[PDB]
């Protein structure tokens, strides 16, 4: 018995995503403000062509 | 004579948005001690610089 599919995902927009986290929430700034906040600011500081 | 300045705007780059919100927006700064500047200057973030 067979169930066919013809779908696929897309690596659509790599300028609107982030990864590679050493996730941890147990430090004043060593693990919160350097991993989650770093990703935060990297996401919200992306420039389309500069400016 | 004093200028009588009333600083009420804090504009910082995106990388400083979280720290500015901590300075103004929470009772504790980074160690549960206190935040003397809570509800003092309303911070607006900006990404047109740096």
From TrEMBL, chain B:
It comes from the Viruses. This is Bacteriophage Mu GpT domain-containing protein. It comes from Pseudomonas phage JBD30. The chain holds residues 255 to 304 of 304 of the full protein.
